[PDB]
Amino acid sequence: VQLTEKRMDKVGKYPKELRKCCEDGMRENPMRFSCQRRTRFISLGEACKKVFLDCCNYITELRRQHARASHLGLA
């Protein structure tokens, strides 16, 4: 989808040493965990967690918007 496009550009906005944190935050969520919950045991600093959390909340909203658009036959 064009969400891949929105993700690629989302990752690029961060310093290179924090990009993987953003990528991991935007992975699929089959266990239906909250973004906060998904940070609890990776336990990597204040920087990586914060980036993980932002990108997670970012992609989560995008997924819902895409789901609504698909449901309404707009996308």
Helix and strand totals (H; E) in the chain: 3, 0
Angle between helix 46-71 and helix 3-12 axes, rounded to 10 deg: 160
Q: Domains (ranges, CATH) in the chain?
A: 1-75 (1.20.91.20)
Q: What is the torsional sign of CA 13, 61, 44, 46? A: positive
Instruction: Give the three-state DSSP class for 13.
Output: coil
CA–CA dist 4, 47 (Å, integer): 24
